[PDB]
C-alpha cells in the first residue's frame, strides 16, 4: 500500500526543437503531506541546450496533501496507477506536449514520461537557457466522466527576473472507476536546484476546496 516514505524511479525520453535527450533519476517523498524530492541526471543528449524548467512539471499527483473528506482520485487509482497528457502553451508562441504513466513496482513508483517541444523560438529565453524557477501556482481540477482535467496558469522566472507566462492543460486518467472529487484546486510549489552534474526538484502540493 502507500508508505509515509515512498521512492520513485524516473525515465524521460524527450525532444526539444529536434534535439533528442534522455533523463533518469530517483526520488523520495511523503504522499500524505504532498512533499517530494527528486535527483535527476541527463543520460543522453547532454548538456541540454534549453532551460531545464520546461521539463520540471513533467517529473505525480499521488504526492498531494488532500483533505480527509475529499475523494483522492490519485491515491484511489493505486495499485494500478494512472496516466496523464498535457499541453503547454507559452506566451511567446511555443507549444509543447508531455505525457506520463505512474505505476508501482516492488521498490516504489515507476514514473515514465515523454516530452515534445519542437517550436520554441530560437531566439527566446527557453532556447537561451534562461529559466530559473516556476512561480507558485494554483491548478483548477474539474471532474468529468471518470477523468480529471487540470488548468493552471504558470510563470517561469528567468535569470533577469522577467516572467514567461504559460497555460498548462492536463487530463488525468485512472485505469478503474474511483470515487470522484468535486471541482477543487491544488496549490503547487516547485523548486529546482543545480550543481553542474545533477538537477534536484522539490515539490509541495496541497489540495483545497474552493471558497
Q: Where are the domains of the chain?
A: 7-208
CATH of 7-208, one of 3.40.50.970, 1.10.287.1080, 2.60.40.420, 2.40.155.10: 2.40.155.10
Chain mean position to CA 118: 19
Backbone angles phi, psi at 56, to 5 degrees: -55, -50
User: Is the Cβ–Cβ distance between 26 and 36 less than 8 Å?
Assistant: no
Supply 16's cell numbers: 526539444
Tell me 54's DSSP state: G
Resolution (Å) of this entry = 1.8
The contacts found for 31-34 with CB under 8 angstroms, 24 or more apart, are 31/2, 31/4, 31/6, 31/62, 31/63, 31/64, 31/75, 32/2, 32/4, 32/65, 33/65, 34/63, 34/64, 34/65, 34/66, 34/204, 34/205, 34/206, 34/207
Are the C-beta atoms of 66 and 72 separated by less than 8 Å?
A: yes
Task: Give the span between the Cα atoms of 119 and 155, in whole angstroms.
Answer: 19
* Of 80, 86, 100, 105, residue with least CA distance to 174: 80
| 65/142 Cα distance (integer angstroms) | 17
Question: Around Cβ 12, how many Cβ atoms within 10 Å?
Answer: 22
With CA atoms as reference, report the closest residue to 116 among 21, 211, 8, 3.
21
Coil, strand, or helix at residue 105? strand
The whole-angstrom separation of Cα 63 and Cα 82 is 13
Amino acid at each position: 500500500v502507500l508508505k509515509e516514505n515512498m521512492k520513485t524511479t524516473y525515465h524521460m525520453d524527450g525532444s526539444v526543437n529536434g534535439h533528442y535527450f534522455t533523463i533518469e533519476g530517483e526520488g523520495t517523498g511523503n504522499p500524505f503531506k504532498g512533499q517530494q524530492s527528486l535527483k535527476l541526471r541527463v543520460t543522453k543528449g547532454g548538456p541540454l541546450p534549453f532551460a531545464f524548467d520546461i521539463l520540471s512539471p513533467t517529473f505525480n499527483r499521488v504526492f498531494t496533501d488532500y483533505p480527509e473528506d475529499m475523494p483522492d482520485y490519485f491515491k484511489q487509482s493505486l495499485p494500478e496507477g494512472y496516466s496523464w497528457e498535457r499541453t503547454m502553451m507559452y506566451e511567446d508562441g511555443a507549444t509543447a506536449t508531455a505525457s506520463a504513466r505512474i505505476s508501482l513496482d516492488k521498490n516504489g513508483f515507476v514514473h515514465k514520461s515523454t516530452f515534445h517541444g519542437e517550436n520554441f523560438p530560437a531566439n527566446g529565453p527557453v532556447m537561451k537557457k534562461k529559466g530559473v524557477n516556476w512561480e507558485p501556482s494554483s491548478e483548477t481540477i474539474t471532474p468529468s466522466d471518470g477523468i480529471l482535467k487540470g488548468d493552471v496558469t504558470m510563470f517561469l522566472v528567468l535569470e533577469g527576473g522577467q516572467r514567461l507566462k504559460a497555460l498548462f492543460q492536463t487530463t488525468y486518467k485512472a485505469n478503474k472507476v474511483v470515487k470522484m472529487p468535486p471541482r477543487h484546486k491544488i496549490e503547487h510549489r516547485l523548486v529546482r536546484s543545480e550543481d553542474g552534474e545533477t538537477i534536484q526538484l522539490q515539490e509541495h502540493a496541497v489540495a483545497k476546496y474552493f471558497t
